[PDB]
Coordinates of N, CA and C in Angstrom, one line a residue:
Chain Q
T302 N 17.3 15.1 28.0 CA 17.1 13.9 28.6 C 16.8 13.8 30.1
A303 N 17.9 15.0 30.1 CA 17.7 15.4 31.6 C 16.0 16.1 32.5
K304 N 16.0 16.6 31.6 CA 14.4 17.3 32.1 C 13.6 16.1 32.1
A305 N 13.9 15.2 30.8 CA 13.0 14.4 31.4 C 12.6 13.2 31.9
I306 N 14.2 12.7 33.1 CA 14.1 12.5 33.6 C 14.1 12.9 34.9
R307 N 14.1 14.6 35.1 CA 13.8 15.1 36.4 C 12.3 14.8 36.4
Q308 N 11.5 15.1 35.3 CA 10.2 15.2 35.3 C 9.5 14.2 35.4
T309 N 10.1 12.9 34.5 CA 9.4 11.6 34.9 C 9.9 10.7 36.1
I310 N 11.1 11.5 37.2 CA 10.7 11.0 38.6 C 9.5 11.9 39.6
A311 N 9.3 12.6 38.9 CA 9.4 14.1 40.0 C 7.0 13.6 39.7
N312 N 6.8 12.5 39.0 CA 5.1 12.2 39.4 C 5.5 10.8 40.1
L313 N 6.3 10.3 40.4 CA 6.8 9.2 41.0 C 7.1 9.5 42.4
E314 N 8.1 10.8 43.3 CA 7.9 10.9 44.3 C 6.5 10.9 45.2
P315 N 5.4 11.4 44.7 CA 4.0 11.1 45.4 C 3.8 9.7 46.4
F316 N 4.2 8.7 45.3 CA 3.9 7.5 45.3 C 5.2 6.3 46.7
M317 N 6.6 7.6 46.8 CA 7.6 6.7 47.8 C 7.0 7.0 49.4
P318 N 7.4 6.5 49.8 CA 7.4 5.8 51.7 C 8.3 7.4 52.4
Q319 N 8.1 7.3 53.5 CA 8.3 8.3 53.7 C 9.9 8.1 54.1
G320 N 10.2 7.2 54.7 CA 12.1 7.2 55.1 C 12.7 7.1 53.4
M321 N 12.0 7.9 52.6 CA 12.8 7.9 51.3 C 12.9 9.2 50.7
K322 N 14.2 9.6 49.8 CA 14.1 10.7 49.4 C 15.2 10.7 48.0
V323 N 15.3 11.4 47.1 CA 15.8 11.2 46.1 C 17.3 12.2 46.1
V324 N 18.5 12.2 45.7 CA 19.1 13.0 45.3 C 19.8 13.0 43.7
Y325 N 20.7 13.7 43.6 CA 21.3 13.3 42.5 C 22.9 13.7 42.6
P326 N 24.0 12.3 42.9 CA 25.2 12.2 43.5 C 25.5 12.8 42.0
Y327 N 25.8 12.8 41.3 CA 26.8 12.7 39.8 C 25.5 13.1 38.5
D328 N 26.0 14.2 38.3 CA 25.4 15.1 37.0 C 26.3 16.0 36.2
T329 N 26.1 15.9 34.5 CA 27.2 16.6 34.0 C 26.7 17.4 33.2
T330 N 24.7 17.4 33.2 CA 24.3 19.0 32.6 C 24.9 20.5 32.8
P331 N 25.0 20.6 33.8 CA 25.3 22.1 34.9 C 26.4 22.3 34.0
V332 N 27.1 21.9 33.6 CA 28.4 22.3 32.9 C 28.2 22.8 32.0
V333 N 27.5 22.4 30.8 CA 27.4 22.6 29.6 C 26.1 23.6 29.9
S334 N 25.1 24.1 30.7 CA 23.9 25.2 31.2 C 25.4 26.6 31.2
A335 N 26.3 25.8 32.2 CA 26.9 27.3 32.6 C 27.7 27.4 31.4
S336 N 28.4 26.8 30.6 CA 29.2 27.0 29.5 C 28.7 28.0 28.8
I337 N 27.3 27.2 27.7 CA 26.7 27.9 27.1 C 26.1 29.3 28.0
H338 N 25.2 29.5 29.1 CA 25.3 30.6 29.6 C 26.2 31.9 29.8
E339 N 27.8 32.0 29.8 CA 28.5 32.1 29.8 C 29.4 32.9 28.9
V340 N 28.9 31.9 27.6 CA 29.5 32.7 25.6 C 29.0 33.1 25.9
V341 N 27.1 33.1 25.9 CA 26.2 34.3 25.3 C 26.4 35.4 26.7
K342 N 26.8 34.9 27.1 CA 27.2 36.8 28.4 C 27.9 37.9 28.1
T343 N 29.0 36.0 27.7 CA 30.0 37.4 27.0 C 30.0 37.9 25.9
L344 N 29.1 37.2 25.0 CA 28.6 38.0 23.5 C 27.5 39.0 23.8
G345 N 26.5 39.3 24.9 CA 25.9 40.0 25.0 C 26.5 40.9 25.3
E346 N 27.6 41.1 26.5 CA 28.5 42.4 27.1 C 29.5 42.7 26.2
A347 N 29.9 41.8 25.2 CA 31.0 42.2 23.8 C 29.6 43.1 23.2
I348 N 28.5 43.0 22.5 CA 28.3 43.4 21.5 C 28.0 45.0 21.7
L349 N 27.1 44.7 23.1 CA 27.0 46.9 23.7 C 28.0 47.3 24.0
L350 N 29.6 46.9 24.7 CA 30.4 47.2 24.4 C 31.7 48.1 23.1
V351 N 31.1 47.5 22.2 CA 31.9 47.9 21.1 C 30.7 49.0 20.2
Chain I
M653 N -31.8 0.7 19.4 CA -31.3 1.4 20.7 C -32.7 1.1 21.5
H654 N -33.9 1.6 20.7 CA -35.2 0.8 21.4 C -35.8 -0.6 21.1
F655 N -35.3 -1.1 20.4 CA -35.4 -2.3 19.9 C -34.8 -3.5 21.1
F656 N -33.1 -3.2 21.2 CA -32.7 -4.3 21.7 C -32.8 -3.8 23.1
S657 N -33.5 -3.5 23.7 CA -33.9 -3.1 25.2 C -34.5 -4.4 25.6
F658 N -34.0 -5.7 25.3 CA -34.5 -6.9 25.9 C -33.8 -7.2 27.0
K659 N -34.0 -8.8 27.6 CA -33.5 -9.3 28.8 C -32.3 -9.7 29.0
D660 N -32.1 -10.3 28.0 CA -30.7 -11.6 28.3 C -29.3 -11.0 28.2
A661 N -29.1 -9.9 27.2 CA -28.1 -9.2 26.9 C -27.9 -8.0 26.9
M662 N -27.1 -7.4 27.2 CA -26.4 -6.1 27.7 C -26.0 -5.6 26.7
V663 N -26.9 -5.9 25.6 CA -26.3 -5.3 23.9 C -26.2 -4.0 23.6
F664 N -25.5 -3.7 23.6 CA -24.5 -1.8 22.8 C -24.5 -1.6 21.5
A665 N -25.2 -0.9 21.3 CA -24.6 -0.5 19.7 C -23.8 0.8 19.2
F666 N -23.7 0.8 18.5 CA -22.8 2.0 18.0 C -22.0 2.2 16.4
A667 N -22.3 3.6 16.4 CA -21.2 3.9 15.0 C -19.7 3.8 15.3
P668 N -18.9 3.3 14.7 CA -17.5 4.1 14.4 C -17.2 5.6 14.0
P669 N -16.1 5.8 13.9 CA -15.8 7.4 13.7 C -15.3 7.3 12.4
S670 N -15.9 8.5 12.7 CA -15.3 8.7 10.4 C -13.8 8.0 9.5
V671 N -12.8 8.4 10.9 CA -11.6 7.5 10.6 C -11.6 6.6 11.5
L672 N -11.7 5.2 10.7 CA -11.4 4.2 11.7 C -10.5 3.3 12.3
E673 N -9.3 4.0 11.0 CA -7.9 4.0 11.4 C -7.4 5.0 13.2
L674 N -8.0 6.3 13.7 CA -7.8 6.8 15.1 C -8.7 6.0 15.8
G675 N -8.8 4.8 16.8 CA -9.4 4.6 17.7 C -10.8 4.3 16.6
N676 N -11.7 4.0 18.1 CA -12.8 2.7 17.9 C -14.0 3.3 18.1
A677 N -14.0 4.7 19.0 CA -15.3 5.4 20.0 C -14.9 6.7 20.3
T678 N -15.7 7.5 20.2 CA -15.6 9.1 20.3 C -15.2 9.2 21.7
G679 N -15.0 10.4 22.3 CA -14.9 10.7 23.7 C -13.6 10.6 24.0
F680 N -13.4 10.9 25.3 CA -12.1 10.9 26.3 C -11.9 8.9 27.0
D681 N -11.4 9.2 27.2 CA -10.6 7.5 27.7 C -9.4 7.7 28.2
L682 N -9.7 6.5 29.6 CA -7.9 7.3 30.6 C -7.9 5.8 31.0
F683 N -6.6 6.1 31.7 CA -6.1 4.6 32.7 C -5.6 4.9 34.0
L684 N -6.4 3.8 34.8 CA -6.3 4.0 36.2 C -5.0 3.0 36.4
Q685 N -4.1 3.6 37.2 CA -3.2 2.7 37.4 C -2.5 2.2 38.7
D686 N -1.9 1.4 39.1 CA -2.0 1.0 40.6 C 0.1 1.2 40.6
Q687 N 0.4 2.3 41.4 CA 2.1 2.6 41.4 C 2.5 2.4 43.3
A688 N 1.9 2.4 43.9 CA 2.3 1.8 45.1 C 2.3 0.4 45.3
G689 N 1.8 -0.8 44.7 CA 2.1 -2.1 44.6 C 0.7 -2.5 45.3
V690 N -0.5 -1.4 45.3 CA -1.6 -2.3 46.4 C -2.3 -3.1 44.8
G691 N -3.3 -4.5 46.0 CA -3.8 -5.8 45.1 C -4.7 -4.6 44.0
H692 N -5.7 -6.1 42.9 CA -6.7 -5.7 42.2 C -7.8 -5.2 42.8
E693 N -7.9 -6.0 43.7 CA -9.1 -5.8 44.5 C -9.7 -4.2 44.8
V694 N -8.0 -3.6 44.8 CA -8.6 -2.2 45.9 C -8.7 -1.5 44.6
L695 N -7.7 -2.0 43.3 CA -8.0 -1.0 42.4 C -9.4 -1.1 41.6
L696 N -9.9 -2.5 41.6 CA -11.1 -2.5 41.6 C -12.2 -1.9 42.3
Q697 N -12.0 -1.4 43.4 CA -13.3 -0.6 43.8 C -12.9 0.2 43.9
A698 N -11.5 0.9 43.3 CA -11.6 2.3 43.0 C -12.1 2.6 41.7
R699 N -12.1 1.5 41.2 CA -12.5 2.3 39.7 C -14.3 1.9 39.7
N700 N -14.7 1.1 40.4 CA -16.4 1.3 40.8 C -16.6 2.6 41.5
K701 N -16.2 3.1 42.5 CA -15.8 4.3 43.3 C -15.8 5.4 42.2
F702 N -15.3 5.1 40.8 CA -14.8 6.6 39.9 C -16.1 6.5 39.2
Chain R
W753 N 27.6 -24.3 45.2 CA 28.5 -22.8 45.4 C 28.5 -21.9 43.8
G754 N 27.1 -22.4 43.0 CA 27.2 -21.9 42.3 C 26.0 -20.8 41.9
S755 N 25.3 -20.8 43.2 CA 23.7 -19.8 43.1 C 23.3 -20.4 42.1
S756 N 22.6 -21.6 41.3 CA 21.7 -22.2 40.6 C 20.7 -21.4 40.9
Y757 N 19.4 -20.8 39.7 CA 18.1 -19.6 39.6 C 17.5 -20.9 39.3
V758 N 16.4 -21.1 39.7 CA 15.5 -21.9 39.1 C 14.5 -21.4 38.5
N759 N 13.5 -21.0 39.0 CA 12.2 -20.4 38.2 C 11.9 -19.2 39.4
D760 N 10.5 -18.2 38.8 CA 10.4 -17.8 39.2 C 9.3 -17.5 40.0
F761 N 8.8 -16.8 40.6 CA 7.9 -16.3 41.7 C 7.4 -14.9 42.3
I762 N 6.1 -14.9 42.1 CA 5.6 -13.4 42.3 C 5.5 -13.1 43.7
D763 N 5.9 -11.6 43.4 CA 6.5 -10.6 44.8 C 5.7 -9.3 44.5
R764 N 4.5 -9.1 45.4 CA 4.0 -7.6 46.1 C 3.3 -7.2 43.8
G765 N 3.3 -8.0 43.4 CA 2.7 -7.8 41.5 C 3.8 -8.1 40.4
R766 N 4.9 -7.9 41.5 CA 5.8 -7.8 40.4 C 6.5 -9.8 40.4
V767 N 7.4 -9.7 39.4 CA 7.9 -11.0 39.1 C 9.4 -11.0 38.9
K768 N 10.1 -12.3 40.4 CA 10.6 -12.0 40.8 C 11.9 -13.2 40.4
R769 N 12.6 -13.7 41.1 CA 13.6 -15.0 40.9 C 13.8 -15.7 42.3
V770 N 14.3 -17.1 42.1 CA 14.3 -17.3 43.5 C 15.9 -18.6 43.1
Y771 N 16.7 -18.1 43.7 CA 18.4 -18.5 43.6 C 18.2 -19.6 44.8
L772 N 19.2 -20.8 44.9 CA 19.8 -21.8 45.4 C 21.1 -22.2 45.8
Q773 N 21.9 -22.1 46.7 CA 22.9 -22.3 47.4 C 23.5 -22.5 48.5
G774 N 24.5 -23.2 49.1 CA 24.4 -23.1 50.5 C 25.0 -22.2 51.8
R775 N 24.6 -22.5 52.4 CA 24.6 -21.7 53.6 C 26.3 -20.5 53.6
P776 N 26.4 -19.8 54.1 CA 28.2 -19.3 54.0 C 28.8 -19.9 54.3
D777 N 28.8 -20.4 55.7 CA 30.0 -21.2 56.8 C 30.0 -22.7 56.0
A778 N 29.3 -23.2 55.6 CA 29.0 -24.0 54.2 C 30.5 -23.6 53.2
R779 N 30.4 -22.6 53.0 CA 31.7 -22.4 51.7 C 32.2 -21.3 52.6
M780 N 33.4 -21.4 53.0 CA 34.5 -20.0 53.6 C 35.9 -20.4 53.4
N781 N 36.1 -22.0 53.5 CA 37.8 -22.3 53.4 C 37.2 -23.5 52.6
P782 N 38.8 -23.9 52.0 CA 39.0 -25.3 51.0 C 38.5 -26.4 51.9
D783 N 38.3 -26.4 53.3 CA 38.1 -27.7 53.6 C 36.6 -27.8 53.9
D784 N 35.7 -26.3 54.3 CA 34.3 -26.9 53.8 C 33.9 -27.2 52.9
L785 N 34.5 -27.1 51.7 CA 34.3 -27.7 50.7 C 34.4 -29.1 51.2
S786 N 34.9 -29.6 51.5 CA 34.8 -31.1 51.9 C 33.9 -31.7 52.8
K787 N 32.8 -30.7 53.1 CA 31.5 -31.1 54.2 C 30.6 -31.4 53.4
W788 N 29.9 -31.6 51.4 CA 28.9 -31.7 51.5 C 29.3 -33.3 51.0
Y789 N 28.1 -33.8 50.6 CA 27.4 -35.5 50.7 C 27.1 -35.6 49.2
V790 N 27.0 -36.7 48.2 CA 26.6 -37.1 47.6 C 25.7 -38.6 47.1
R791 N 24.8 -38.9 46.8 CA 24.2 -40.0 47.4 C 24.4 -40.9 45.8
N792 N 25.2 -41.7 46.5 CA 25.7 -43.3 45.2 C 24.0 -43.6 44.9
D793 N 25.1 -44.7 43.8 CA 23.4 -45.5 43.5 C 22.8 -46.1 44.2
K794 N 23.2 -47.0 45.3 CA 23.1 -47.4 46.0 C 21.8 -47.4 47.3
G795 N 22.1 -46.3 47.3 CA 21.3 -45.0 48.3 C 22.1 -44.6 49.3
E796 N 23.6 -44.9 49.7 CA 24.2 -44.1 50.4 C 25.1 -42.7 50.7
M797 N 25.3 -41.8 51.6 CA 25.7 -40.7 51.6 C 27.5 -41.1 51.1
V798 N 28.5 -40.2 50.4 CA 29.5 -40.5 50.3 C 29.9 -38.8 50.6
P799 N 31.1 -38.8 51.4 CA 31.6 -37.4 51.3 C 32.3 -36.7 50.3
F800 N 32.3 -35.8 49.9 CA 33.5 -35.1 48.8 C 34.4 -35.4 49.0
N801 N 35.2 -35.1 49.7 CA 36.8 -35.3 49.6 C 37.0 -37.0 49.9
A802 N 36.2 -37.5 49.6 CA 36.6 -39.0 49.4 C 37.2 -39.3 48.3

């Protein structure tokens, strides 16, 4: 749904006026992506080191 | 479509698709939308240009 | 003082609202609430602090 939001505004920014932009001051999905990436990184190192 | 080429009405005859539940005409279809808030006549002349 | 919403109005193709309220300097202190007048039955105006 975060990707759906980021793509459903990405087709709206061509129609924005020149004195505007969009940023994301508050977001929670990067810690989810970083957590799952970190745990699969630890598992991928673990299965070769053993 | 040869006999109906008469003066008064712009009569258009066709056959429905084989599944009438799915649409009423074969071929593509699309919408032209006003995103910036421009008036109706601009979209009308854009439709005429298209 | 209650900001009554009366009906709708069109703006740039989108439907918006029209509100009704006094000016800010008419409502900032308690004695400013004494600045308002009501019309009685026979026609004339009577102040609110009366």
